[PDB]
Structure 1
């Protein structure tokens, strides 16, 4: 009876899915590889229909599965995890395992040189810097600039206001174009809209600022597993715990970069991560 391991179609889906598969095979659990099956909807239907067994899900996406998109509890990491875990077990008998501390949510990343020079690590620091007349040009989508949940919420909470001459506004939502603007300083860009663990952040020499007042919902990746399968292989829980523990924001960025910038296979990158940290 094979454990069917899967993931979402994106890079991180590939990386995390292979870490799970590698760890399972490494500890004598026979597996079926259905990694990168499709977007979140297809993968959810799959596990709830019993077609897959385990895959990496993000805490905050449970906001959308259980019709709680507008709830401010998802902006807290601990409460988001506890809620995702409780709901899925009660509703679906899906067990959420120990999460990664990485937060793959909408964020602002700065060029390292500007961050170092001005001691900017958090959005509180960034807001003070912008408010006080600091030099910034943010590359962002029109949706990020304008939708109430994004930059307007950052602006309100951290106490700054972006002038039109501090903004490069792009039509699309792909963070590839925004990361490259900041990386290459197009029209003096020095800051970029990103998702926390985008691979392009590592090689571009950017740093993600901490969302220290919790304005965006938290999307921490965790392995989630069908209960009947976990009952058969109960050691899966403890074996994935230390592994996901070690998957911080920068580590995740680098692994994703190895795949989406270096063109390495997700399988190889997963195994290299595991051997490097003594898990295989």
Structure 2
């Protein structure tokens, strides 16, 4: 029986799904390609119904699957991973394999020139800079500026507030527009609302600030696999471990950018990543 590989329909799903596919093929596990099948609900329905076997899911998404969206545990990367793994095994006999360290969550990215000049690496650094009178204009969605769990939470935890003249507020939630604003200094923008592994970040010369006090839930991608399929191919676990360990934030940003900015096929990007790191030939 072929192992059915899938993913969510977004760019990163295509990248991670093709990475899984290629690792399996290189290690002589035959596959069926159902990559980029649909949105999260469609892919969840498919794996629980046994229509797909393995795909990349994010730790923090388990908060929504298991009716725990309001639980603070998801903001702790290790706790979130363990809770996702335990619940999906107990409820669904789905096995979570080793995660990537990349946190693909709501974030603030700064222009690299501003970050370098002011030695800003973390949101704590950013709060100190803003509170002290540092020059900032942040491009963000109305939802990000106003929803309790977003900018307001960052402001409270990191000790800063943003004035109206320090914000470019857009109606929609697409980070394409906010990334571009900061990249181009539109209306003096030097910061953008992003998700951590957004492909646009790499070529736009922005850098994601670390959420060092853990305000946002953590979304680490990991391959997850139906137990019965893993039992048939038990080496899948160890084969994917070093591969996902190498997928740090900047590496994933770059791979995503190759697809969504460079126009490369995800299959090609995945194979190049594996060959470069000794996981394929």
With the shorter chain as reference, the TM-score category is over 0.9
Shift of 1:20: 0.2
Shift of 1:149: 0.2
Q: 1:34-77 CA deviation, whole Å, 9 max, x = no partner?
A: 00000000000000000000000000000000000000000000
Alignment correspondent of 2:67: 67
Shift of 1:226: 0.1
Q: 1:117-155 CA deviation, whole Å, 9 max, x = no partner?
A: 000000000000000000000000000000000000000
**Secondary structure of 2:199's match?**
coil
Shift of 1:16: 0.1
TM-score (ref. length: structure 1): 1.00
Alignment correspondent of 2:249: 249
Output the CA distance in 2 between the equivalents of 1:85 and 1:38: 22
Output the CA distance in 2 between the equivalents of 1:24 and 1:30: 7
TM-score (ref. length: structure 2): 1.00
Q: 1:136-175 CA deviation, whole Å, 9 max, x = no partner?
A: 0000000000000000000000000000000000000000
Output the CA distance in 2 between the equivalents of 1:228 and 1:117: 53
Q: 1:189-242 CA deviation, whole Å, 9 max, x = no partner?
A: 000000000000000000000000000000000000000000000000000000
Count of aligned pairs: 280
Output the CA distance in 1 between the equivalents of 2:278 and 2:233: 22
Runs of at least 5 residues in structure 2 that lack an aligned partner in the other structure:
none
**Secondary structure of 2:198's match?**
coil
Runs of at least 5 residues in structure 1 that lack an aligned partner in the other structure:
none
**Secondary structure of 1:200's match?**
helix
Shift of 1:265: 0.1
Shift of 1:3: 0.2
Shift of 1:255: 0.2
**Secondary structure of 2:143's match?**
helix
The ranges of structure 1 where at least 4 consecutive aligned residues each deviate by more than 4 angstroms after the TM superposition are: none
Output the CA distance in 2 between the equivalents of 1:55 and 1:210: 27
Shift of 1:99: 0.1
Shift of 1:184: 0.2
Output the CA distance in 1 between the equivalents of 2:212 and 2:273: 29
Shift of 1:279: 0.4
**Secondary structure of 2:103's match?**
coil
Output the CA distance in 2 between the equivalents of 1:17 and 1:32: 12
**Secondary structure of 1:125's match?**
helix
